[PDB]
Amino acid sequence: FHFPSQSVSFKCASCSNSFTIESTLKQKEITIDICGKCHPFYIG
Amino acid sequence: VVVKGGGFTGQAGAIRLGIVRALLQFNPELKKILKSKKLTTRDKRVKERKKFGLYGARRAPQFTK
Amino acid sequence: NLKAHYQKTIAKELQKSFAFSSIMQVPRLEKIVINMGVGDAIRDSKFLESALNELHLISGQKPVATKAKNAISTYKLRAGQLIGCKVTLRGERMWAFLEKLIYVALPRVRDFRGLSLKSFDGRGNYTIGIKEQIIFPEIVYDDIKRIRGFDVTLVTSTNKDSEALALLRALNLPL
Amino acid sequence: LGIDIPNQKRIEIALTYIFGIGLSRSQAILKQANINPDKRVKDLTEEEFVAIRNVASAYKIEGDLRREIALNIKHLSEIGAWRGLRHRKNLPVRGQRTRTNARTRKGPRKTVANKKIE
Amino acid sequence: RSAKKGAFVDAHLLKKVIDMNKQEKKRPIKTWSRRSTIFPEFVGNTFAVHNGKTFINVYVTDDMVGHKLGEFSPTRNFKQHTAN
RNA sequence: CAAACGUGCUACAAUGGCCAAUACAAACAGUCGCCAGCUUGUAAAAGUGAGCAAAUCUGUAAAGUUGGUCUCAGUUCGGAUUGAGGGCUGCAAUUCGUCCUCAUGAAGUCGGAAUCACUAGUAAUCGCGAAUCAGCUAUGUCGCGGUGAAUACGUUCUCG
Numbered sequence: 001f002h003f004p005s006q007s008v009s010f011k012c013a014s015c016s017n018s019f020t021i022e023s024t025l026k027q028k029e030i031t032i033d034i035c036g037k038c039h040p041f042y043i044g
Numbered sequence: 045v046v047v048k049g050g051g052f053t054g055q056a057g058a059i060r061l062g063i064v065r066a067l068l069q070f071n072p073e074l075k076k077i078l079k080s081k082k083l084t085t086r087d088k089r090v091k092e093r094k095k096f097g098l099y100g101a102r103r104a105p106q107f108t109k
Numbered sequence: 110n111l112k113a114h115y116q117k118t119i120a121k122e123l124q125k126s127f128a129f130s131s132i133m134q135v136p137r138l139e140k141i142v143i144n145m146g147v148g149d150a151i152r153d154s155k156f157l158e159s160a161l162n163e164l165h166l167i168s169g170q171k172p173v174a175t176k177a178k179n180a181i182s183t184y185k186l187r188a189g190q191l192i193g194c195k196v197t198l199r200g201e202r203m204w205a206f207l208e209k210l211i212y213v214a215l216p217r218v219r220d221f222r223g224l225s226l227k228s229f230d231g232r233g234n235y236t237i238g239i240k241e242q243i244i245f246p247e248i249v250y251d252d253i254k255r256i257r258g259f260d261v262t263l264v265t266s267t268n269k270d271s272e273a274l275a276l277l278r279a280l281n282l283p284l
Numbered sequence: 285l286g287i288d289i290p291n292q293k294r295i296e297i298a299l300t301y302i303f304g305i306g307l308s309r310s311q312a313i314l315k316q317a318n319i320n321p322d323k324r325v326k327d328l329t330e331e332e333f334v335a336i337r338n339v340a341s342a343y344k345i346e347g348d349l350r351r352e353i354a355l356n357i358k359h360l361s362e363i364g365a366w367r368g369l370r371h372r373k374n375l376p377v378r379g380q381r382t383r384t385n386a387r388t389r390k391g392p393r394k395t396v397a398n399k400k401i402e
Numbered sequence: 403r404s405a406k407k408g409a410f411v412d413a414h415l416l417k418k419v420i421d422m423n424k425q426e427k428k429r430p431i432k433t434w435s436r437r438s439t440i441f442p443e444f445v446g447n448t449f450a451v452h453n454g455k456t457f458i459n460v461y462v463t464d465d466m467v468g469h470k471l472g473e474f475s476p477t478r479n480f481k482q483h484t485a486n
Numbered sequence: 487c488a489a490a491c492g493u494g495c496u497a498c499a500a501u502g503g504c505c506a507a508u509a510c511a512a513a514c515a516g517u518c519g520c521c522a523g524c525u526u527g528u529a530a531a532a533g534u535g536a537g538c539a540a541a542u543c544u545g546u547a548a549a550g551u552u553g554g555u556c557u558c559a560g561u562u563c564g565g566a567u568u569g570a571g572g573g574c575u576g577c578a579a580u581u582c583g584u585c586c587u588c589a590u591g592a593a594g595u596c597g598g599a600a601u602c603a604c605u606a607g608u609a610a611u612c613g614c615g616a617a618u619c620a621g622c623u624a625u626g627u628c629g630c631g632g633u634g635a636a637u638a639c640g641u642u643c644u645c646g
Contacts, residue, residue: 005169005205008246014334019111021208024166024247031330032246033286033337036212040341041221042283051632052510052550091607096628103609105493106602219287220347294555297562306589307504307562308528323555349589353569363463364474366580375487376567379582380623382487388567388593396488399486406532410578437578473580483488 014038061085110204119279126275136233136265136276138203143168143196144260150192151184154254157194164194164259167245168206172196210237210261211282214244223283233265233273285340286333295321303346313339411439419443432457436472451475 008023013031015038023030036042045062047055064085067074078084094101123135143164150156157174164172174191198206215221218240228235239258242248265273278284289298299310314321317335344352361368370377374389387393403409415438422431427446434452445464450457454477462474 002169002171003165005166013330018212019208021110021213022205023209030246032213032217033333034216036216036281039216041223042216047510049511049631053633055510089607091631094629098603099494100603100611101608102604104603108492109601217286219285220345293562297556300562304589306591309588312528349569356569359465363465364460365469366473366476367469369476371568378568379580380567384487384489384491386487386567390488392593394488395490396485398489404573406574407577408573408579412577436580470580475580477581481487485488 010035057086110201111208112201112204119276123276123279127272136267136272139199139264139266141198141203141206141264142260142262143172143194143198145174145193145257146260147174147192147194149253149255149257151186155251157192159249159251159253160194162249163245163247164196166247166249167209168196168198168202170196170202207280209245211280213246214239215283217244221283225282225284229270229273231270232268233270234262235273235277236260236262285337285345289326291326292324293326294324295319295326298326304344304349309343313343409439412437416441416443419447422447436470436475438471439469440467440471442467449475453477 004025005022006025007020008025008027009029010018010021010032012018014034017037018035045059047058050058064078064083068078092101097104099105120132120135124130124132127135129135145157145160145164147157147160161172172194173196175193175195176189176191177186178188180187224238225235228237239261241258242253242256263277265276267273285302287302289301295314296307296310299305299314300307305313313336316339317332319332357371361371367377375382376386376389380386412435415433415435418431418433422428423443429448431447431449433447433449434457436451440462444467445462447461449460449462449471451460451471451474452458453475458475460475462471
């Protein structure tokens, strides 16, 4: 048996853009400190 | 009561003696109760002069053997 | 997920970059393997159920452990006593894992400066070294006996490194 | 940075466990953030967090400090200088009593017999 | 420097440095004083610094000028532990 | 400097730290020294510039008190080795000065057989003064004063 994991919202945590990726479905709209598109090491 | 110098407990003892002396001169029979309770003037209880070679007043560093 | 975006843009510019005029000779993604490489579960440790549940949560499919391929005489390991985990990834779960890692784990590292000089087999398959337990948004707060990383690797169709690196750059993995 | 700090404490002490930042600089960075610290508050919002990251990046985080100090020690040790030679033998450099009291780097506790008399 | 002799140098060895800074930088020059702090103009020569037994010849590298000349001259011997 | 004896300071903390306000001393020293106040400087400390040949003035008391404050972690107690930036001193700060700022926050829970001080402002202690210089981890040494105990049955044993 496989436990279902469905999309979790991720649109604004430190910037204004992100892609909706699936995670644990027991919670929705969780915030993270920094993502890829606003990472100072990512671009600079 | 007006004091000059000394710690609060020392000032307390000073005003103790002042109060008792003024009471005694106020009325002689007060003397009697001063002998009844034996709470009386100074017990000459003051910091003794510490000596050379002693870190305190009665303290030697320690004796090695 | 991004497979629609992959076919939307990346495939055509990959075709245009290298002169081949074929829509499928460009490198493609096949599978991602997750291995745990357990070397601490010799005595009554947490025996991977912490790892089992965290890996099953990050990937809903059942993780499968593996036994020793030989008998190592420096421990009590003799062809058995299953260790580690084996998770093969394909379908929607390519992107499910890839975006989670690239945009949720790498910036989440305590300190990350990137490292990509030669991590290939000489045929274009890139290994990724996880550092800490907490790089996933979800994690069970039970402590593994030894805090460790995870073994993950990306495989490519082409046996060449330049095209695989170009595809990874198109996917924007930090170098 | 960005690690989940231990809960159940004031913000002032909350900004101490991070490496590189002690007490006074934690106070200055907190005042720059203007969190208005209260008793045993740990998480209230995220708009404070972004300011904290910005001001921390204005200063130098633990990782870069460790790299720069390691590089400085390497430079002072790979050039002709008594400080580098001293650090290479694992002895204090700044000048202390080196006779019999240096046991912070000179092994936890090890000893050898002296010559015997009589 | 604090301009209040917080990084003072006797500056009387520097006269020989100015002398040798115009003669195509020939290697041999006699120089020994623990009182002197080095500057970028010094690099490219030898110092016969006095440890206490003989004028040991040293060449300061071209990576830094911050510290003093006397710091770069080892004098104390190695312990060579002898546990009796 | 591979080590051990020592003689001490300072810790193992909620018989407290930290944040602020707030008292209570004496004795001694002081004309290129005490430095008042002020410009300041994160503060070190620089500068400006009174007074003091001194019962006029300068040496700012500290423990204590009022409110919080942290709630039993090897921590916020504790701090040294360690890096950088500065300050004073002295013509000189690597050996081989000390001060400040940011960091560094380990080890250490009352320390084994054995041992030392003391019958009252005495031990416990709390901050200051001074011979020493230009300066000096002297955590010394000669003192000042602040709070303030406990115990003393008798010399069999123990030592002199």
